[PDB]
Amino acid sequence: MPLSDTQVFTALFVALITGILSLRLGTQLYK
Amino acid sequence: RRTKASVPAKRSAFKANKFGSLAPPDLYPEFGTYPGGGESPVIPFGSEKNAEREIIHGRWAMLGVTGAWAAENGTGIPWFTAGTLCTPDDCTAVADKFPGAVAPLAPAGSGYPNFWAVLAIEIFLVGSAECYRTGLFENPFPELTQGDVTPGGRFDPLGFAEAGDLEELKIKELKHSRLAMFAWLGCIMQALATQEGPIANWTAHVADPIHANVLTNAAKGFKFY
Amino acid sequence: RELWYPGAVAPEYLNGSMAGDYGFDPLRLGANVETLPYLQEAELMNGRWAMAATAGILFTDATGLPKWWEAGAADYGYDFQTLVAFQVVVMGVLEAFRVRGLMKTPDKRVKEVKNGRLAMVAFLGMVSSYAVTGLSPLEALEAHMANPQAVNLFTSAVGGESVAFIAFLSCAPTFLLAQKTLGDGKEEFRPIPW
Amino acid sequence: DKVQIVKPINGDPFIGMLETPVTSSPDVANFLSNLPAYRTGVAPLLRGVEVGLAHGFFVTGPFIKLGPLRSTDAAELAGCLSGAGLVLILTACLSIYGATAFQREEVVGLKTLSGRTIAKDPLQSSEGWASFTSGWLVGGLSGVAWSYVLTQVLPYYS
Amino acid sequence: MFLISWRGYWQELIETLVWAHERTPLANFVKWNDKPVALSIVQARLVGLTHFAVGFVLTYAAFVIASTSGKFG
Amino acid sequence: MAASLLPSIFVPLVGLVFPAVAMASLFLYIEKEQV
Amino acid sequence: KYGDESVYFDLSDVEATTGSWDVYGVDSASRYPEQQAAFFEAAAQGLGRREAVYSVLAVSAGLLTVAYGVKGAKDAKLPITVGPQQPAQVGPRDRI
Amino acid sequence: DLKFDDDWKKSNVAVHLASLFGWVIPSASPCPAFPDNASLFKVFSDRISENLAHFPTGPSADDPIWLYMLTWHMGLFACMMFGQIGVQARKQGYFG
Numbered sequence: 001m002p003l004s005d006t007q008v009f010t011a012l013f014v015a016l017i018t019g020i021l022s023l024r025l026g027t028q029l030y031k
Numbered sequence: 032r033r034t035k036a037s038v039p040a041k042r043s044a045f046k047a048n049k050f051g052s053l054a055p056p057d058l059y060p061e062f063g064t065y066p067g068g069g070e071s072p073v074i075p076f077g078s079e080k081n082a083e084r085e086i087i088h089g090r091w092a093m094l095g096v097t098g099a100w101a102a103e104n105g106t107g108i109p110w111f112t113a114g115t116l117c118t119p120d121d122c123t124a125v126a127d128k129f130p131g132a133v134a135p136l137a138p139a140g141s142g143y144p145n146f147w148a149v150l151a152i153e154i155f156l157v158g159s160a161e162c163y164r165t166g167l168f169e170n171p172f173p174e175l176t177q178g179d180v181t182p183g184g185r186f187d188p189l190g191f192a193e194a195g196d197l198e199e200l201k202i203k204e205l206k207h208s209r210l211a212m213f214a215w216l217g218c219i220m221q222a223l224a225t226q227e228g229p230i231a232n233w234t235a236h237v238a239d240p241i242h243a244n245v246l247t248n249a250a251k252g253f254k255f256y
Numbered sequence: 257r258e259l260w261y262p263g264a265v266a267p268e269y270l271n272g273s274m275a276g277d278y279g280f281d282p283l284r285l286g287a288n289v290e291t292l293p294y295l296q297e298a299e300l301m302n303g304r305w306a307m308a309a310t311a312g313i314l315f316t317d318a319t320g321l322p323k324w325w326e327a328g329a330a331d332y333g334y335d336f337q338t339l340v341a342f343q344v345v346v347m348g349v350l351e352a353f354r355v356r357g358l359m360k361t362p363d364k365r366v367k368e369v370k371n372g373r374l375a376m377v378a379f380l381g382m383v384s385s386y387a388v389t390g391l392s393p394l395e396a397l398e399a400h401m402a403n404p405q406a407v408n409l410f411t412s413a414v415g416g417e418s419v420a421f422i423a424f425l426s427c428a429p430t431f432l433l434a435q436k437t438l439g440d441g442k443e444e445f446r447p448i449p450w
Numbered sequence: 451d452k453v454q455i456v457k458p459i460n461g462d463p464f465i466g467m468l469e470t471p472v473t474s475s476p477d478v479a480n481f482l483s484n485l486p487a488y489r490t491g492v493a494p495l496l497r498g499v500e501v502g503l504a505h506g507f508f509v510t511g512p513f514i515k516l517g518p519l520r521s522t523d524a525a526e527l528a529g530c531l532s533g534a535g536l537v538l539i540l541t542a543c544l545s546i547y548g549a550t551a552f553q554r555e556e557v558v559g560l561k562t563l564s565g566r567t568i569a570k571d572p573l574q575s576s577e578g579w580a581s582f583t584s585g586w587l588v589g590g591l592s593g594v595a596w597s598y599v600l601t602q603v604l605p606y607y608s
Numbered sequence: 609m610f611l612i613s614w615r616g617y618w619q620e621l622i623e624t625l626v627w628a629h630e631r632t633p634l635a636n637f638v639k640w641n642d643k644p645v646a647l648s649i650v651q652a653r654l655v656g657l658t659h660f661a662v663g664f665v666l667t668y669a670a671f672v673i674a675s676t677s678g679k680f681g
Numbered sequence: 682m683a684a685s686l687l688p689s690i691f692v693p694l695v696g697l698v699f700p701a702v703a704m705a706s707l708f709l710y711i712e713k714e715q716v
Numbered sequence: 717k718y719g720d721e722s723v724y725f726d727l728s729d730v731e732a733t734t735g736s737w738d739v740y741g742v743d744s745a746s747r748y749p750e751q752q753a754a755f756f757e758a759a760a761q762g763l764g765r766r767e768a769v770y771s772v773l774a775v776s777a778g779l780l781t782v783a784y785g786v787k788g789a790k791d792a793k794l795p796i797t798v799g800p801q802q803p804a805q806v807g808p809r810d811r812i
Numbered sequence: 813d814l815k816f817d818d819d820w821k822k823s824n825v826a827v828h829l830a831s832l833f834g835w836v837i838p839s840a841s842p843c844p845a846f847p848d849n850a851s852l853f854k855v856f857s858d859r860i861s862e863n864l865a866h867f868p869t870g871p872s873a874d875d876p877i878w879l880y881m882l883t884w885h886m887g888l889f890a891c892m893m894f895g896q897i898g899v900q901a902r903k904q905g906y907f908g
């Protein structure tokens with residue numbers, strides 16, 4: 001059974017939020 | 032790169048030697064008068080610009096009359112139908128229209144003057160020149176004055192203006208201009224009335240002078256009555 | 257003035273001067289001073305076109321005319337090529353005039369801004385609702401009003417995506433509050449540097 | 451009488467250059483001086499225009515005739531879209547160069563080989579290089595489109 | 609290359625290249641922000657070691673996977 | 682649908698777009714003068 | 717003076733001493749037709765700003781990648797977009 | 813002085829004509845090695861005529877035009893280079 005498109009896009013949006021948080025951590029490290 | 036700035040010391044390939052005036056001291060014994068030398072016989076002088084407008088229409092109508100003359104002499108096609116040859120479609124025909132042309136505008140086969148190609152070149156060349164002549168665009172030759180119909184710098188490489196009397200040459204051009212414009216008007220009216228080219232009308236009028244006139248064709252209604 | 261959420265901090269370049277300024281620019285697109293008037297005018301244009309589009313969609317739908325997505329295929333007097341040539345010429349001339357006027361250069365302004373903003377949201381909604389359900393805006397509204405509890409975006413094919421996005425929106429300002437009270441708010445970088 | 455051709459740069463034998471028939475020949479000097487990059491009195495935008503047109507025109511050709519779709523009927527369209535993409539990349543390279551390169555004062559002036567003091571090239575500045583980049587973009591895209599037109603139009607193209 | 613040849617050949621080569629770029633027409637319009645220099649001794653030792661190790665690992669990974677998959681899948 | 686669309690978008694996004702922006706950005710920062 | 721015999725140092729003529737010479741540059745103010753200049757000024761009216769070019773290239777990057785992943789790749793008939801359209805093969809040990 | 817001389821070429825029309833024609837004439841002289849005592853210039857011109865009939869189609873890889881072209885152009889360019897060297901050297905003090 002393949003993954004539903006909603007599943008893929010929800011995981012991808014969670015990834016986008018994780019990436020935002022990674023940018024926040026990188027900026028905080030750079031200070 | 033260093034600045035050389037040497038002396039060119041070049042002379043014109045041809046530079047007409049002084050020949051002066053080849054006309055009588057009287058310059059317009061004909062009907063009317065040149066602008067700036069008397070009062071207009073009939074029509075009111077519209078504006079100072081009208082003299083230069085007359086010169087430009089004159090030179091253009093000279094070139095148009097000679098073009099219709101040579102086109103009908105070399106191809107037999109009337110000038111008023113020569114436009115139908117080069118069209119967005121089948122502009123290949125317009126190529127071989129010059130008697131003795133070593134080569135065609137359209138080499139045999141596809142190779143050809145396209146209407147749009149010709150047109151695009153025509154706009155880009157003639158409009159540029161038209162603008163540069165007038166106040167549009169700018170002046171690429173500061174030594175000459177835009178808005179002057181007789182610049183007489185690079186535009187007389189042979190130097191006839193300075194070689195002779197300038198103003199007699201000017202009036203000579205003006206008379207040629209008015210003659211050719213009136214002849215052009217005659218050509219358009221003949222095209223309208225007889226549907227045949229200028230040299231065709233000439234030939235008909237000289238073969239039998241007594242007939243083949245305005246009034247002869249009027250007897251048939253100019254093919255409309 | 258009220259900002260884009262209770263407790264937000266407006267960016268320093270968003271001081272309420274512009275119409276509709278709610279201090280919303282997380283990605284700092286209008287941070288550059290010289291492009292900010294351009295971005296204002298891009299907002300106003302996209303809003304105006306969305307407003308006109310919303311009117312021409314809703315009236316068309318409610319008057320029995322062909323559906324907005326189908327309206328292209330209808331048989332018109334002029335074919336596609338001549339119509340696009342007309343469009344290219346006239347819109348080029350009009351947009352040239354608009355550009356030169358822009359180069360030259362309260363209540364009603366704010367009104368227009370808000371209206372355009374709603375329109376752009378409403379137009380995006382119409383396109384998304386058609387792409388997901390295949391129902392036109394008035395049909396979609398009737399379907400929703402028929403069964404409001406279960407017929408919605410969050411129960412459609414993209415439902416979980418929308419629920420996750422709304423969760424992100426609901427949990428963003430709380431994290432921003434932590435960032436303010438814990439961090440110094442002294443970011444040297446912007447999400448869009450130019 | 452025993453003429454020597456190769457000479458030091460501007461007669462100074464202590465600068466890292468030598469004037470040769472490749473560098474200081476009159477024909478070479480006139481050709482290079484007439485190229486748009488060396489027209490320092492002209493606006494950087496228009497020099498960038500010609501530059502972009504020339505460069506974007508030729509650069510399309512390799513993609514047309516040697517690209518992946520060179521055999522297909524869409525060879526020209528692929529090659530021209532490749533050329534446009536390369537023009538966009540080079541525009542990005544130009545923008546970043548313009549942002550970074552001109553950050554220093556460069557207090558020393560410039561003179562011609564005749565010794566005439568001349569102003570610095572407006573191209574050699576941040577805003578001037580920005581105008582040059584914009585001219586490059588317009589010229590490159592116009593040249594790529596012209597190459598497409600000519601491949602679709604020119605009679606003896608194959 | 610990085611392991612055997614050492615800095616000072618490459619520095620002089622870069623010096624000649626600097627001269628060439630500075631004296632090339634139409635290329636002197638573009639100038640480096642950072643002066644181009646050869647890789648330092650430690651830097652180049654590292655770069656060569658990294659290339660050595662990367663090529664070592666990739667070559668053997670390709671071998672051990674391809675042979676085993678060709679004979680067994 | 683994800684399978685037929687997302688690879689063809691994200692492979693150029695991660696292998697041509699993101700590299701270009703990242704290299705340009707890093708260049709602009711590294712060459713950025715201290716002041 | 718820099719122009720003296722066998723003298724190539726001059727604190728007044730620093731440019732000649734240091735070799736900062738304009739080799740091929742020309743300071744002529746106009747070379748192009750003025751209206752052509754006006755057209756190409758208007759064609760790059762908004763792009764003369766560097767950050768405007770940055771926005772142009774970011775938008776162009778996004779649109780080109782979206783169009784390539786949606787329509788451009790298929791239009792170019794890339795083999796990767798075309799399916800395998802062939803029977804599959806089984807690795808050794810009957811491992812598909 | 814140490815300034816570059818813009819007349820480095822010293823292009824002399826008499827040198828150009830002397831070198832060109834004083835290679836053409838000897839290369840247009842009878843050569844008993846070639847068939848019918850034809851000259852190198854003769855056979856080269858024959859090959860040029862034969863290949864100019866098919867103007868777009870280039871000469872075949874095996875066609876004798878290439879060898880004639882090389883063996884004629886070498887002698888021509890030798891005459892050009894040596895003629896310039898000898899004239900400018902005689903004008904100068906290299907010989908007398």
Ligand code: CLA
Pocket residue numbers: 011012015687688689691692695
């Ligand atoms: C580190 C883990 C990792 C790795 C190595 C890969 C590798 C790959 N992914 Mg996958 N992916 C991951 C995590 C990962 N992914 C996660 C968590 C998600 C979200 C659910 C996705 C969602 C995803 C989709 C939807 C698609 C891919 C695709 C791809 C392929 C290339 C295109 C691309 O890079 O777009 C990746 C797309 C992104 C949006 C970025 C996702 C990457 C994660 C979230 C961040 C990883 C960052 C890393 C740890 C640190 C980077 C810093 C530095 C070292 C460079 C490639 C096989 C495409 C494919 O199969 O092409 C054939 C494709 O269509 N990926």
Ligand code: CLA
Pocket residue numbers: 826827828830831832834886887890891892894895896897898899901902907
């Ligand atoms: C093939 C052409 C050729 C050759 C070899 C020579 C040879 C000579 N000329 Mg020159 N000359 C030529 C054409 C040639 N001339 C032409 C066309 C002109 C008119 C522009 C002149 C005008 C001219 C003047 C005004 C003077 C000379 C002088 C001389 C002599 C002095 C040395 C010299 O400059 O050459 C070097 C020549 C050598 C033979 C030295 C050895 C060279 C070796 C063997 C290699 C040569 C290869 C050979 C040429 C074959 C070429 C074919 C190629 C495929 C490799 C020398 C005998 C001067 C002199 O004193 O003459 C009385 C003199 O004052 N010449």
Ligand code: CLA
Pocket residue numbers: 062063064065066067068069070071072074075076077078081082083084085088209210212213216
């Ligand atoms: C368009 C061409 C043209 C222009 C611009 C002028 C302009 C001028 N002429 Mg010239 N002239 C022309 C044609 C023209 N003339 C022709 C063809 C002739 C020969 C018959 C003359 C003979 C002539 C003489 C003998 C004299 C002038 C004079 C003048 C000046 C005074 C007149 C004036 O300003 O009003 C210009 C007003 C008009 C041109 C309007 C007249 C319109 C009528 C109805 C003619 C229309 C032609 C046609 C039927 C249109 C057909 C349309 C088509 C659709 C069928 C002025 C510089 C006088 C001068 O310099 O004064 C000092 C002077 O003495 N001209």
Ligand SMILES: CC1=C(/C=C/C(C)=C/C=C/C(C)=C/C=C/C=C(C)/C=C/C=C(C)/C=C/C2=C(C)CCCC2(C)C)C(C)(C)CCC1
Pocket residue numbers: 012015016018019020022023025026687690694782
């Ligand atoms: C719009 C759209 C689209 C697109 C979209 C996208 C584009 C998405 C994405 C998403 C994404 C894009 C995601 C991402 C994620 C990421 C991540 C998740 C990352 C992470 C990272 C990390 C974790 C790192 C870290 C680090 C480093 C390494 C450096 C420094 C330090 C640190 C630690 C910070 C498409 C066209 C398709 C379709 C239509 C719509």
